[PDB]
From a paper:
The chemokine receptor CCR5 plays a vital role in immune surveillance and inflammation. CCR5 exerts its physiological functions by binding to multiple chemokines, such as macrophage inflammatory protein (MIP-1α, also known as CCL3) and RANTES (regulated on activation normal T cell expressed and secreted, also known as CCL5). Here we report three cryo-electron microscopy structures of Gi1 protein-coupled CCR5 in a ligand-free state and in complex with the chemokine MIP-1α or RANTES, as well as the crystal structure of MIP-1α-bound CCR5.
To obtain molecular details of CCR5-chemokine recognition at high resolution, crystallography studies of the CCR5–MIP-1α complex were also carried out. Our functional data revealed limited effects of these mutations on receptor signaling with a wild-type level of MIP-1α potency (EC50) and 70–110% of maximum response (span), except for the mutation A2336.33D that forms a salt bridge with the intracellular tip of helix I to limit the conformational change of helix VI. The crystal structure of CCR5–MIP-1α was solved at 2.6 Å resolution. Our crystal structure of the CCR5–MIP-1α complex allowed observation of interactions between the chemokine and the distal N-terminal segment till residue P8 in CCR5, providing insights into the chemokine-receptor recognition. In the CCR5–MIP-1α structure three tyrosine residues in the receptor N terminus, Y10, Y14, and Y15, which are potentially sulfated and have been suggested to be essential for binding to positively charged residues on the binding surface of chemokines, are surrounded by four basic residues in MIP-1α including R17, K44, R45, and R47, with Y10 adjacent to K44 and R45 while Y14 and Y15 approaching R17 and R47. Although no polar interaction between these residues was observed due to lack of sulfation, this binding mode may represent a low-affinity binding state between the CCR5 N terminus and MIP-1α, as previous NMR studies using peptides corresponding to the N termini of CKRs indicated that nonsulfated peptides bound to the same region as the sulfopeptides, albeit more weakly.
Residue numbers in the entry: -93 to -27, 8 to 223, 1001 to 1017, 1019 to 1054, 227 to 313
Amino acid sequence: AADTPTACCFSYCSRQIPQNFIADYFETSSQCSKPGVIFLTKRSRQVCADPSEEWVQKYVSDLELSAPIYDINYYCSEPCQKINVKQIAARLLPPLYSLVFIFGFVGNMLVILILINYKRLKSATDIYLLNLAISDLFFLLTVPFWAHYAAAQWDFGNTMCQLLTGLYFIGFFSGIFFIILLTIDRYLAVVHAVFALKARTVTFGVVTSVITWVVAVFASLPNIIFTRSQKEGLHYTCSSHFPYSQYQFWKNFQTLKIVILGLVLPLLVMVICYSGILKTLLRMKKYTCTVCGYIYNPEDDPDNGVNPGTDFKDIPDDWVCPLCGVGKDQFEEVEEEKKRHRDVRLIFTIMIVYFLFWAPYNIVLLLNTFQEFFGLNNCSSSNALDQAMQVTEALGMTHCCINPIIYAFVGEEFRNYLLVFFQ
Ligand SMILES: [Zn+2]
């Protein structure tokens, strides 16, 4: 989704333009610093206007109900034209999106088919992997439209604008949520085996998938409500437009929705969960006395010659079960194995690679949030900033073709199911 503006307003008109000199108008993109109206005149030129004022609101009202030569430079301003931004987009991104659309679609249909036909959807983990691949496809469906939009202009109309925007973000938000669920799932399997026996069930997975999609809709509602297509001086766009009375509210809101859900939240999860997972994996192991039933606790004998900081492999062979009196020989490793712990390393790869490709975007959004602070709220800065945003978005969009390549890089069962058709 590009709200990349064709032009933005960093000033307005000083005095009311004569109504009859105005041909047409457009409302500027919410990607812009400031709420704005650009008026097109009965000369080719165009100028900036404040949507607050009754004259502007009345002019627009009249122009919507509808559908002499002056030098108005004395009191009006030309908008910031985003020539460089759009020219770079149209040149480079079409062949990339081609590329990732091809690899991505094939990739993610294969994963889906395999998860349903070979790995058979046995547990919640399989369910989330499946919903991840479906989120990735929903994002892919939209890519051919975006590439065209970049090369040319929006020509799919308003409904398509609203539904494609919907599918993009639903795909985005749900993709994030399922990577998070996959991480949390593996954390419970490894650490809190307590609750993991209820949580790992297929029914549990489906109930939490259904809720998750629904929340991904709620998350996406404002994006759909405020988005529409619009004629901007005989070029059509697909972008969002916020009410000028709540403009900053919405801008801040929607941007931080994305930073918080996309960067902050999953970073907390990842750190926490992989700190957790490492501690459990590195923990000293307990043992049980075969005849006795007594459990040796390697963190806990204050009565025997036993160092609380050491496990069973350091205790001399002379050691005898305190409860019953048999020697060390009669101890086994207390039957504890992480069979439940099926796919930890894969999820950690997927989680890391997600950051690799999407962090530059979330960072550039924070730069855009604090545009005002860095004095980036001017024409020349915003063109560099918008250009960074198109680049980092491009990177980000690439990631939807990568998941299914990881399933071969660090997976195993996804490789072996291909030897089926050679032998
Ligand atoms: Zn014993």
